[PDB]
Structures are given as structure tokens and as C-alpha cells.
């Protein structure tokens, strides 16, 4: 039987990779930590309150210009939003109201949405009339879109519920790139800030790190021990971490290949829904299940702060590309930016 | 603020009027969960996920089919937290079919949908398809092959009011929500009216929670 | 996109005349409204302003009391009333789209305009330059002044730049200081701090050749500047 000889070759490399990761593991980031300064005590506060959204809100993506902002709820209505003075610079309505996820162009001329739909719908925001119209509907996807990142104005890449991802062109309105390989449901994506790989967490609990180009994963990641909901690349790009539902946060290195450092309490029984990195990654903000926000210290594993302040549970946060204000949206169809 | 501020101003507050118009307008509608194992016949039309859109006495009904997600459950059923009702549809001519038997995958779903946390208050209409099915091929086949013990007659009537309470059983704790059950057939609309029926229901709930005396 | 006016032709004074201008090609009711007259030797005055939802009604001073502007959504139509015309209201009326929202692009388009004839505390804005000799593949600079500071306390400067050609409407260049509008090539730029402005044109063809005149939108009443033309 060639399975059972498979299966065994299977083994063996897992165990290989075990025993080159033990081998690549000198000391902990603890140790080497544990004579740097701590961060002390950050209070940010609510500086704006953003309403008009009538629904849960699921998802929200900061702009490159760090001050317009995109957020998709339920009632079919996708708001762009202008964070310094709370105007409501766009409404687009949905023709799917089961939208779980939004993004928002580097160049600000597109934003994307997606969910129980299967289909990834991009807005083009710059018309000669005055209104935002559809410019684009990818569809193939056999799942729910779970997450959206653009590349730039042609190129998408998307995350779906049939355990595969997808880079898409959009004038083309084809799949160029199909990634496959996760067992469980992709729940979330992030790109390099090169732009040339990407990360992705699935329902499998495991992490997978593939190259655009050549549309193959490069590596994978097992720490956890449920769903991961979040992911996120570090400011370098040679670090993630990652959110799941067993209540941990986990920072993996790319270049060892092996998790770095477990942010948990046990007070925390709740999962995890969106984490960030700050400017220089040294702050790792984590939304709940617990209607409030924790800001870890990235490099210590201290709970450095709280953000507390939503009636329901937090979707969603953000950073903006300054790292000026944190930008966290929940349940209780309020979006809140902090400082 | 300078003359494009103010005019902006004046934008955002229209987008904020159209958006509570729209909002009045969609909660004065009620949504349908449907779920099934096991026959969506005369109960939709009498990719992704289907919508339905139909109005019947001055009610508007949008009802949801999610049979085309073959996915996890648990990451996306949060989405419908807020539904009027869920309609689970369960076919009564599949008890001795083997997919495990359908049936009893049909109890384990509905274990599943009914006893599920964000379906804590939110009313289940029952709907029993294929009764003149059922009827022809319950003297050719006992009710053994799926429930040994049933230690009752084999008649139409009392295996049909069997598989009900059978599938009525499964709600633990029955004190802040309903399971209206109902027998399809094809004669005066009726299917649609007992679903107007139960629905009528939730809203006088939810107006005893608007006027404070519930 | 376009708009087309009607109306005008010869009135006596003391008369009336309702103006109209029917849209087509976008979405009328989102943006705000202007009528803009030109007086047939001189440059661009703005006359009135209406906004998104008729909630704001604003006229010039010269006009007030005896234009009425409005509008009908459905209809996609402007409606500009005129009543005790004067021998000053013999102008080439022009109807002005406006949106306005954070990096919007106001004044984008404009109308071809109705010529009428009738027989018989506000920001100067001041260029100097006029009849300036050109020559193609040479930079060109235009200056412009303002009697009040443009720079507002967000970091916006309310200047906008157009252009007439003989014959042809006026062209948004720049809306707002240093920025290009849609379909201007990379050879206008737009400069200044202040009171004190420059646009240049590092080598025009020879459709630049025109009229090109200043705006200021930090205060209502809108005024324009005596425009500065280029001749070959």
C-alpha cells in the first residue's frame, strides 16, 4: 500500500521539521527582553464617535492618506467616512446586505466588499457623474469572502470560506493566481508591505505564508490550537501574529519558522477577533469577544492597556498608516477612534 | 468652518437622512431564516446564498436560503442573530432512508439550529414535507427503522404526531421561545398564512417590549 | 455629462425672463448649482448658488431682490427667474456644476450659456497681467492676488484656476491650490502662499491660447479676477 508509505513520508518530515525548529530555538524573546524597558500605562481615549451605521458592523479599512476611512454592516450600506470632522463623505448601497468584509484602495480610487454573496464587488469612487457605481464583480469563489486586500489598482486578492485564496484582475475579472493548500476555512488575510507575499490564517489553526508570484506556499505555521480569525504582518515584514478563539494571541517569525511569543491571561476566555501592529510594532491591539480592546506590549507580553467603551463585540480595528489614532468597530453599530 | 465645510456639512446631514429613511423603511420587514436537510419545494416558490422577496397582508417577507454554503456554520449563522423567524423544512417520506438516516441528521441539525446560543428567543416554524409520501409508504414500512422505540400503531396520523413531538422534543428550554409546527399541503395558501400567523406572534412580543409591559 | 441653458434674447428693461437649464449625463440632485454671467467685453461675475436639496439659496448683491434661482430634481432643470431687468443684466449666462465633499473637484463643469440683452466686505481678486505675448514651447507664468488671505485653517487655499478659449466655456484647471483637475495635462502647475499666486504652463500648445481667470471660494460672495489673456 503506497498510502500507508506516504503517510509514514508525511511523518518523517514533520518530524525533520520538528527537530530543525528545535535546532533553530537558542532563547526565548523573554530572555532577551527581560532587560528592556517596559512600557508603563497607555490611556487612549474615544477622540471621535461615528454613527449612522444601523447594523452590526463587521468590517472597516483605514485609507493611505490616514484620515478617510471605509466601514461595511449589515444594512446593506458600505460608509466612507472622513474621520477628522465625522462627515459622511460617501453611502454605497449593497445589493447583498451579508457583507463580512471592505477595503479600501492604496490609491483611494476603489474600495472592495464581499461575504455570504461569494462575490467580490469593487466601487469605483472617481466618476465623471457624481454617484459610486459597481466597477467590478469577481465571482468564482465557492465560499464566503472573509477578507479583501487590494495590491494595487488592478490586482486584488481575496480570502474565502473554500479554503483557497484568490489574486484577481480586475479589468481581466479573472482569477490569475488560485492558492491552495489550508484544510479549514480562511478566515483572514494580510499582505507584506512589499507586496510581494502574503499571510493567511485559517480555520485548520494554521497560518500560511505564500509568494504572489509564484502562487505557492512558502511556509506554515501550527501554534495555535482553534480557529484563527486574525492575522497580521509586523512593520518589517519577516514577523505575523495572530488572533484565534482559544482566547491567545501568537507572534510567529518568518525567517525561524516557529512562534516567537504567546500573549494570553487567564481572565481572557474569550476569542479574538481583529489584532493590529502599531507604527513600530511594539503595540499589538486585540479586539474581543468581551466588548473592549487590549493593547499588548509586543516584545514583553504585558497588557500594556484597555480600550474599553463598545456595548458589543468588537469586529474589527485598524491602525492608520502614521500610526496617529486606532480606529475599532463592533457590534453595537457605533465605529470609535482612539487616541 | 469655510463655505466647501459648511457645504459638506449639508452633504453628510442628507446622507444621514437618506440612511434613516432607508433604516425605517427596512425594519417595518421581516426575515426568514431557511434551513433544511430535505425538500425546498412549495415553501420557496409554492451560488451564494437566495434571496426571496413576497408580500402578504400588508407584510413585507424576505427569506434567506443558505443551502449553498457547504462551510462551517458556526462563523457565519452570527449574521442571521437577528432574524424574526427561522423555517426548518423536514422531509417525512426520508425516515428509513440512509444518507446514517436522514432523519436523524434532520434532529441532529435541528438539535443544532433550535438549542444554538444567538437562537436563544427566535421562533421556529416546522414545516412536514412529503405527508401523502409518508402516508403511502408507512403500510409498507414501520417506523422501526428509526425509532425502536415507538410501540405504537402504524397509521398515518399517529407516526405523523410521533415525528412531531419526536422533533418538538429537542427544544430545552421552551419557556422564552416557540416551535410552531405545520403538515404542507397545496390547498388556499395556507402555508404561507401560518407563517403570517406565527410571525404576527413575534411582532406582538416585540410590541409588548416597545410599550414597556412585557 | 453636459448642461444646456435656454431662454435669453432681447427683453426690454423693466421686464422678465425665466432662465432654464436641462441636465444630462449625471446625477443632478448630489450637486450643488451655480449661475455665473459674463458681460460681453468684460470677464466672469457670479450671479446666484443653489444647493444639493435646496437647502441653501444664496444670491449676489447686484441681483438681490430680483433673481430667483431653483430647481426641479425630477426634471433634472435650473430655473433662474428674473424680474425689473436693468440695462446691466445684458450678459452671457453660464450654469456652473458644484459638488462638494473632502477632495472633490467644484466648478468641473460648465454650461455653453444664453446670451441676454436687455435695451436701454468682498475679496478683490487681482491680476495685473494682460495681453501677455506667448510663444509655443515656452513657460508661461500668470500671477494672481487677493485682497484677503486664501490660506484657511484646515491647510486649505480656495484658489481656482480657468480657462477661456475663443469661443468655449470655461475650464476648470485647478480647484484647489496645487491640485490638477481631471483631463488637465502635467504642464499646469499651481503655486503661491497667501495673498500671492502663479500658475504655470511649462510649454503650451496652441489650444492654450484664452482667458484665464482666478476664483476664490474662502467667503460667499464668489468673486473672480479681471482675466489675464494669452495671444500668439
Known amino acids: 500500500s503506497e498510502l500507508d508509505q506516504l503517510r509514514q513520508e508525511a511523518e518523517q518530515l514533520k518530524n525533520q521539521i520538528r527537530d530543525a525548529r528545535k535546532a533553530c530555538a537558542d532563547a526565548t524573546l523573554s530572555q532577551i527582553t527581560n532587560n528592556i524597558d517596559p512600557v508603563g500605562r497607555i490611556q487612549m481615549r474615544t477622540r471621535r464617535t461615528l454613527r449612522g451605521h444601523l447594523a452590526k458592523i463587521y468590517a472597516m479599512h483605514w485609507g493611505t492618506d490616514s484620515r478617510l476611512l471605509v466601514s461595511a454592516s449589515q444594512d446593506g450600506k458600505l460608509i466612507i467616512w472622513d474621520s477628522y470632522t465625522t462627515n459622511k463623505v460617501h453611502a454605497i448601497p449593497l445589493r447583498s446586505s451579508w457583507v463580512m468584509t471592505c477595503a479600501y484602495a492604496p490609491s483611494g480610487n476603489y474600495v472592495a466588499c464581499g461575504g455570504l454573496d461569494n462575490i467580490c464587488s469593487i466601487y469605483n469612487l472617481k466618476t465623471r457623474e457624481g454617484n459610486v457605481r459597481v466597477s467590478r464583480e469577481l465571482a468564482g469563489h465557492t465560499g464566503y469572502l472573509s477578507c479583501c486586500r487590494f495590491l494595487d489598482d488592478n490586482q486584488i486578492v481575496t480570502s474565502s470560506g473554500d479554503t483557497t485564496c484568490a489574486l484577481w484582475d480586475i479589468e481581466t475579472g479573472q482569477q490569475t493566481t488560485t492558492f491552495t493548500g489550508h484544510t479549514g476555512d480562511v478566515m483572514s488575510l494580510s499582505l507584506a508591505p512589499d507586496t510581494r507575499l502574503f499571510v493567511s490564517g485559517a480555520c485548520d489553526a494554521s497560518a500560511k505564508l505564500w509568494d504572489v508570484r509564484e502562487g505557492m506556499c512558502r511556509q506554515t505555521f501550527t501554534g495555535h490550537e482553534s480557529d484563527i480569525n486574525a492575522i497580521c504582518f509586523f512593520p518589517n515584514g519577516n514577523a505575523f501574529a495572530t488572533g484565534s478563539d482559544d482566547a491567545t494571541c501568537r507572534l510567529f517569525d518568518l525567517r525561524a519558522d516557529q512562534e516567537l511569543m504567546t500573549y494570553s491571561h487567564d481572565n481572557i476566555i474569550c476569542g479574538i477577533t481583529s489584532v493590529s501592529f502599531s507604527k513600530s510594532g511594539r503595540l499589538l491591539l486585540a479586539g474581543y469577544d468581551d466588548f473592549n480592546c487590549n493593547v499588548w506590549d509586543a516584545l514583553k507580553a504585558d497588557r500594556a492597556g484597555v480600550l474599553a467603551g463598545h456595548d458589543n463585540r468588537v469586529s474589527c480595528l485598524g491602525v492608520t498608516d502614521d500610526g496617529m489614532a486606532v480606529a475599532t468597530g463592533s457590534w453595537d453599530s457605533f465605529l470609535k477612534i482612539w487616541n | 468652518l469655510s463655505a466647501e465645510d459648511k457645504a459638506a456639512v449639508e452633504r453628510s446631514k442628507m446622507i444621514d437622512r437618506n440612511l434613516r429613511e432607508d433604516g425605517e423603511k427596512a425594519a417595518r420587514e421581516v426575515k426568514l431564516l431557511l434551513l433544511g436537510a430535505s425538500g425546498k419545494n412549495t415553501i420557496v416558490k409554492q451560488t451564494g446564498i437566495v434571496e426571496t422577496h413576497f408580500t402578504f397582508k400588508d407584510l413585507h417577507f424576505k427569506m434567506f436560503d443558505v443551502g449553498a454554503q457547504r462551510s462551517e456554520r458556526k462563523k457565519w449563522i452570527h449574521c442571521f442573530e437577528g432574524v424574526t423567524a427561522i423555517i426548518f423544512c423536514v422531509a417525512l417520506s426520508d425516515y428509513d432512508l440512509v444518507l446514517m438516516n436522514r432523519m436523524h441528521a434532520s434532529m441532529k441539525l435541528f438539535d443544532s439550529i433550535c438549542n444554538n446560543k444567538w437562537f436563544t428567543d427566535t421562533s421556529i416554524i416546522l414545516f412536514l414535507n412529503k405527508k401523502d409520501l409518508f402516508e403511502e409508504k408507512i403500510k409498507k414500512s414501520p417506523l422501526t427503522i428509526c425509532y425502536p422505540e415507538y410501540a405504537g400503531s402504524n397509521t398515518y396520523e399517529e407516526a405523523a404526531a410521533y415525528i412531531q413531538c419526536q422533533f418538538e422534543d429537542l427544544n430545552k428550554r421552551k419557556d422564552t421561545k416557540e416551535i410552531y409546527t405545520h403538515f404542507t399541503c397545496s390547498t388556499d395558501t395556507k402555508n404561507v398564512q401560518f407563517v403570517f400567523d406565527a410571525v404576527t406572534d413575534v411582532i406582538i412580543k416585540n410590541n409588548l417590549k416597545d410599550c414597556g409591559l412585557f | 455629462v453636459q448642461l444646456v441653458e435656454s431662454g435669453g434674447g432681447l427683453v426690454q428693461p423693466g421686464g422678465s425672463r425665466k432662465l432654464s437649464c436641462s441636465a444630462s449625463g449625471f446625477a443632478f440632485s448630489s450637486f450643488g448649482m451655480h449661475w455665473v454671467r459674463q458681460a460681453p467685453e468684460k470677464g466672469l461675475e457670479w450671479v446666484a448658488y443653489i444647493s444639493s436639496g435646496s437647502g441653501t439659496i444664496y444670491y449676489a448683491d447686484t441681483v438681490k431682490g430680483r433673481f430667483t434661482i431653483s430647481r426641479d430634481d425630477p426634471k433634472n432643470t435650473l430655473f433662474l427667474q428674473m424680474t425689473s431687468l436693468r440695462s446691466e443684466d445684458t450678459a452671457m449666462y453660464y450654469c456652473?456644476?458644484?459638488?462638494?465633499?473632502?477632495?472633490?473637484?467644484?466648478?468641473?463643469?460648465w454650461g455653453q450659456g444664453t446670451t441676454l440683452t436687455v435695451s436701454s466686505s468682498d475679496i478683490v481678486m487681482t491680476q495685473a497681467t494682460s495681453s501677455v505675448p506667448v510663444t509655443p514651447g515656452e513657460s508661461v507664468s500668470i500671477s494672481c492676488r487677493s485682497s484677503?488671505?486664501?490660506?484657511?485653517?484646515?491647510?486649505?487655499?480656495?484658489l481656482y484656476w480657468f480657462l477661456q478659449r475663443p469661443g468655449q466655456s470655461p475650464q476648470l484647471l485647478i480647484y484647489r491650490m496645487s491640485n490638477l483637475a481631471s483631463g488637465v495635462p502635467d504642464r499646469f502647475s499651481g503655486s503661491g502662499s497667501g495673498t500671492a499666486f502663479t500658475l504655470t504652463i511649462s510649454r503650451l500648445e496652441a489650444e492654450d491660447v484664452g482667458v484665464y481667470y482666478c476664483?476664490?471660494?474662502?467667503?460667499?460672495?464668489?468673486?473672480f479676477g479681471a482675466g489675464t489673456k494669452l495671444e500668439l
Open positions: 484677503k488671505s486664501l490660506l484657511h485653517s484646515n491647510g486649505n487655499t480656495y
Open positions: 476664483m476664490q471660494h474662502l467667503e460667499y460672495p464668489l468673486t
Open positions: 456652473v456644476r458644484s459638488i462638494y465633499y473632502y477632495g472633490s473637484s467644484p466648478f468641473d463643469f
